[PDB]
Amino acid sequence: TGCVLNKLFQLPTPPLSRHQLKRLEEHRYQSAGRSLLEPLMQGYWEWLVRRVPSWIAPNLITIIGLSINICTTILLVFYCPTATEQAPLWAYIACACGLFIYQSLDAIDGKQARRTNSSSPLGELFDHGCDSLSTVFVVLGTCIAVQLGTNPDWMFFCCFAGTFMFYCAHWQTYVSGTLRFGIIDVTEVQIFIIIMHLLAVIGGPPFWQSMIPVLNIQMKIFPALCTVAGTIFSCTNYFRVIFTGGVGKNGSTIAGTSVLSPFLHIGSVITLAAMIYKKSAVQLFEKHPCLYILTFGFVSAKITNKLVVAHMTKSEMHLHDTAFIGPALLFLDQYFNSFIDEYIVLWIALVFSFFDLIRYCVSVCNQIASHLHIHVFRIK
Amino acid sequence: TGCVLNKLFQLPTPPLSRHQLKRLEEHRYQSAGRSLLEPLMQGYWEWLVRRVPSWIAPNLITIIGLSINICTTILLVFYCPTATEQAPLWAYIACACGLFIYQSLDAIDGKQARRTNSSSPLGELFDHGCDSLSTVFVVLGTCIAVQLGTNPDWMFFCCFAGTFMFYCAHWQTYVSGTLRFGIIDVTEVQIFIIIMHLLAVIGGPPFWQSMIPVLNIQMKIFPALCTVAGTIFSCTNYFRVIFTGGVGKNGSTIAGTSVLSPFLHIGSVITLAAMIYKKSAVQLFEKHPCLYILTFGFVSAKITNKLVVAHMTKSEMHLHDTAFIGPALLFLDQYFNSFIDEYIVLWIALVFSFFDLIRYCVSVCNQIASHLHIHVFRIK
Numbered sequence: 001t002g003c004v005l006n007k008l009f010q011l012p013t014p015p016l017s018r019h020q021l022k023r024l025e026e027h028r029y030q031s032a033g034r035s036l037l038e039p040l041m042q043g044y045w046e047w048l049v050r051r052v053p054s055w056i057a058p059n060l061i062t063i064i065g066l067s068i069n070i071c072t073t074i075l076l077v078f079y080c081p082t083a084t085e086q087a088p089l090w091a092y093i094a095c096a097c098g099l100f101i102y103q104s105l106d107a108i109d110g111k112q113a114r115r116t117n118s119s120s121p122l123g124e125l126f127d128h129g130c131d132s133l134s135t136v137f138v139v140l141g142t143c144i145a146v147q148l149g150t151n152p153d154w155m156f157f158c159c160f161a162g163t164f165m166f167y168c169a170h171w172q173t174y175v176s177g178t179l180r181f182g183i184i185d186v187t188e189v190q191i192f193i194i195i196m197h198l199l200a201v202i203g204g205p206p207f208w209q210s211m212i213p214v215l216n217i218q219m220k221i222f223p224a225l226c227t228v229a230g231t232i233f234s235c236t237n238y239f240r241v242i243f244t245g246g247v248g249k250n251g252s253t254i255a256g257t258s259v260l261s262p263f264l265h266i267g268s269v270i271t272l273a274a275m276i277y278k279k280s281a282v283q284l285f286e287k288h289p290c291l292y293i294l295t296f297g298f299v300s301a302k303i304t305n306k307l308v309v310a311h312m313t314k315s316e317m318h319l320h321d322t323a324f325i326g327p328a329l330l331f332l333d334q335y336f337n338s339f340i341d342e343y344i345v346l347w348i349a350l351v352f353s354f355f356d357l358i359r360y361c362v363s364v365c366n367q368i369a370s371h372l373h374i375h376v377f378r379i380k
Numbered sequence: 381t382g383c384v385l386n387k388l389f390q391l392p393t394p395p396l397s398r399h400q401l402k403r404l405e406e407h408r409y410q411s412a413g414r415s416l417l418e419p420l421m422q423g424y425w426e427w428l429v430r431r432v433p434s435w436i437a438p439n440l441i442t443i444i445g446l447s448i449n450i451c452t453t454i455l456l457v458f459y460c461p462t463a464t465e466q467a468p469l470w471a472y473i474a475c476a477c478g479l480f481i482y483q484s485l486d487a488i489d490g491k492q493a494r495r496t497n498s499s500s501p502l503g504e505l506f507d508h509g510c511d512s513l514s515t516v517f518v519v520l521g522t523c524i525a526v527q528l529g530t531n532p533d534w535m536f537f538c539c540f541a542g543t544f545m546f547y548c549a550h551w552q553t554y555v556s557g558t559l560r561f562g563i564i565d566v567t568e569v570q571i572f573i574i575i576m577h578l579l580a581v582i583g584g585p586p587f588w589q590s591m592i593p594v595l596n597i598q599m600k601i602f603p604a605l606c607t608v609a610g611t612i613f614s615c616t617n618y619f620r621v622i623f624t625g626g627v628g629k630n631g632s633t634i635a636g637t638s639v640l641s642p643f644l645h646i647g648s649v650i651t652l653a654a655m656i657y658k659k660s661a662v663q664l665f666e667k668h669p670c671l672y673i674l675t676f677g678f679v680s681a682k683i684t685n686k687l688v689v690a691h692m693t694k695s696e697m698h699l700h701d702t703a704f705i706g707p708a709l710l711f712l713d714q715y716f717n718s719f720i721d722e723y724i725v726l727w728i729a730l731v732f733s734f735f736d737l738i739r740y741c742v743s744v745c746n747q748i749a750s751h752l753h754i755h756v757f758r759i760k
């Protein structure tokens with residue numbers, strides 16, 4: 001049983017060459033910046049990390065957070081598959097508490113890693129790889145909490161904008177070699193989403209459906225407008241650095257590739273999602289938005305994880321990836337006038353994309369661990 | 381002017397690494413077999429090659445043949461763009477004479493190369509690369525000569541079957557390391573096509589439209605049926621060797637890749653052509669068959685040329701290639717309910733695919749020539 005499962009979760013050929021592997025050992029973490037709310041939260045996270053026993057490995061801490069976040073959001077998706085129903089109030093509380101636990105466990109893992117001298121490139125790759133999956137669930141859970149499914153175009157834009165900003169942060173890191181935090185960053189966004197779930201508990205759908213008298217727009221559209229405002233601010237900071245901050249030869253990226261090369265990958269993901277949405281004869285996204293977001297979210301998360309790998313290995317990005325097979329199944333089916341029900345194809349695309357993501361992640365983590373002679377979830 | 385044109389016909393990165401280049405020098409031509417009509421034709425070709433002066437380089441001989449073949453077929457396409465009209469009789473004669481000149485010039489180039497001690501890997505790569513382009517024009521010219529445009533499904537099958545058999549011959553060479561000639565091969569097929577053009581001169585459309593009394597099928601369908609019969613025979617010889625003749629480790633190909641890997645490339649070409657045909661709302665192939673065959677013919681010829689390169693460099697085949705961009709343009713347009721007229725897109729796809737083919741061929745030939753310090757069309 002263990003032999004068949006192990007063969008299932010690794011690709012037949014190793015994804016990284018030995019030369020990238022050697023170059024990965026030379027990586028040194030560099031960040032430059034400070035968010036607005038981080039210094040107040042620093043005292044809590046410094047207190048919290050001291051209470052954690054020294055035998056818990058970093059990669060085990062992050063995955064506990066993600067599992068809590070996944071389970072609470074999947075339960076919420078189970079209650080509200082079209083994002084139009086009202087869930088029991090405790091489900092939003094569970095997501096609110098789950099995200100708070102996630103944020104607290106995430107922010108202490110690198111501090112714990114330093115305290116126990118277990119900082120390693122596996123931990124850094126695993127963290128950003130875990131953050132990439134969690135972000136998909138955060139934007140989906142938020143959209144359910146605000147019932148954004150009644151306005152699919154706003155739901156489509158906001159969910160894919162959030163994944164694109166998170167991708168752009170790693171794109172900025174791929175260009176400049178340094179993770180740069182803005183004035184409004186992950187800390188403020190996550191805290192705002194936690195507070196938003198409690199107003200959804202207190203006021204429900206009637207509160208969210210009320211009209212803002214001065215603008216004659218529904219208040220429910222305001223977080224989506226906040227997402228627009230956030231997108232301009234976040235893109236402006238990243239793109240200034242994208243055009244001026246290339247550390248490679250002749251101002252290229254650190255890998256020596258064109259500064260526009262990551263755009264093609266995330267652009268293809270967003271474009272495929274937009275074509276399949278606007279061409280669907282059965283209005284697949286409007287009837288099944290959570291299932292749709294999860295399908296393309298796993299595709300987007302993997303493409304982000306390849307960018308993290310491309311950063312960590314100082315390698316080019318190949319546009320051709322198996323992650324696009326799932327969207328292509330949806331794409332080919334809709335091309336033949338939906339000969340199979342797109343809902344069935346979407347489930348097929350979901351299951352494939354999930355397993356393909358898991359197969360990649362397990363194979364990369366095991367390969368790095370075998371090279372460094374460390375265990376992923378246990379400190380020696 | 382020369383600098384801008386030179387930048388246009390080469391890719392920014394060299395298509396072959398130095399290690400493939402070194403391995404290319406170790407290649408030694410091996411063939412095993414004899415066609416039925418070749419020994420009678422051998423005396424003519426041995427006589428003909430002795431009349432050629434020793435200063436004409438091999439690669440210059442092949443390209444003169446191809447240019448004659450291209451010009452006569454393109455003129456025929458110009459007179460009969462839907463393959464339903466009747467051309468002047470001299471145009472079929474010109475194609476008949478042009479193909480006869482082609483065959484005679486092709487068959488003597490390697491004999492001339494041996495006589496002048498100018499045999500080189502550039503010549504072998506250029507030859508099969510030239511044969512791959514010529515075959516597309518031969519099947520198209522044949523279909524015009526027999527007016528197969530009145531039965532598009534037969535026209536589609538026969539043209540793509542011929543390209544697939546030619547691909548399969550190189551696939552067989554990629555598997556077994558040796559070019560193997562059948563009892564019915566290129567010599568018999570080309571001579572049969574030459575004779576067929578003269579009956580089209582003598583009898584015209586009324587002859588070709590006459591019914592075969594015993595079968596109650598039109599006689600015009602018989603060459604297409606001959607193409608079916610030829611396909612079974614040719615595939616049977618190639619596929620027996622494909623399953624038993626792998627010289628690589630554990631019976632794999634000589635490059636160590638799966639024996640099914642070339643199938644995906646030619647399969648994708650044939651499948652894309654079939655999807656675009658059956659989905660076209662304007663019946664693009666039925667109104668414009670020659671333009672359609674030329675578009676996908678250049679795509680197919682390039683994919684064949686990559687297989688020759690993959691053979692000559694002992695390398696794997698990458699499925700991702702720029703050759704598919706042109707078909708994808710047709711494919712994306714038809715997906716959006718033909719927002720642009722597919723005929724305009726087909727011209728765009730033709731021009732792109734032609735230039736992309738020419739760019740690849742010029743870049744590969746110049747790269748090999750620079751490494752071997754030889755000139756492509758001149759003997760020192």
Ligand SMILES: CCCCCCCC/C=C/CCCCCCCC(=O)O[C@@H](COC(=O)CCCCCCCCCCCCCCC)COP(=O)([O-])OCC[N+](C)(C)C
Nearest residue numbers: 107131135138142158162165166169185186226227230234
């Ligand atoms: C709700 C209000 C709307 C807009 C408000 C303004 C938003 C625009 C502003 C933001 C600009 C900054 C870019 C965004 C974050 C990327 C930063 C990054 O590198 O990732 C981080 C991970 O990320 C996570 O922790 C997971 C993401 C959680 C929420 C999802 C973010 C998408 C935005 C959702 C919004 C739309 C959803 C709403 C639905 C309609 C880096 O992780 P780390 O640094 O290794 O972690 C430990 C270190 N730490 C302590 C420093 C963290």
Ligand SMILES: CCCCCCCC/C=C/CCCCCCCC(=O)O[C@@H](COC(=O)CCCCCCCCCCCCCCC)COP(=O)([O-])OCC[N+](C)(C)C
Nearest residue numbers: 487511515518522538542545546549565566606607610614
């Ligand atoms: C018309 C009757 C229908 C069917 C009849 C039976 C067909 C089935 C049987 C054939 C089985 C054999 C496979 C086919 C040939 C591949 C061999 C190869 O390696 O390529 C050769 C090149 O090829 C050329 O010279 C160009 C091709 C010319 C005609 C196109 C062939 C496609 C079939 C069109 C038919 C459909 C079109 C009709 C439209 C309806 C190798 O070149 P070479 O060896 O380096 O050249 C010099 C050496 N030489 C002297 C040895 C040559």
Ligand SMILES: [Mg+2]
Nearest residue numbers: 106107109127
């Ligand atoms: Mg963290």
Ligand SMILES: [Mg+2]
Nearest residue numbers: 106127128131
């Ligand atoms: Mg993190």
Ligand SMILES: [Mg+2]
Nearest residue numbers: 486487489507
């Ligand atoms: Mg020849």
Ligand SMILES: [Mg+2]
Nearest residue numbers: 486507508511
């Ligand atoms: Mg030849």
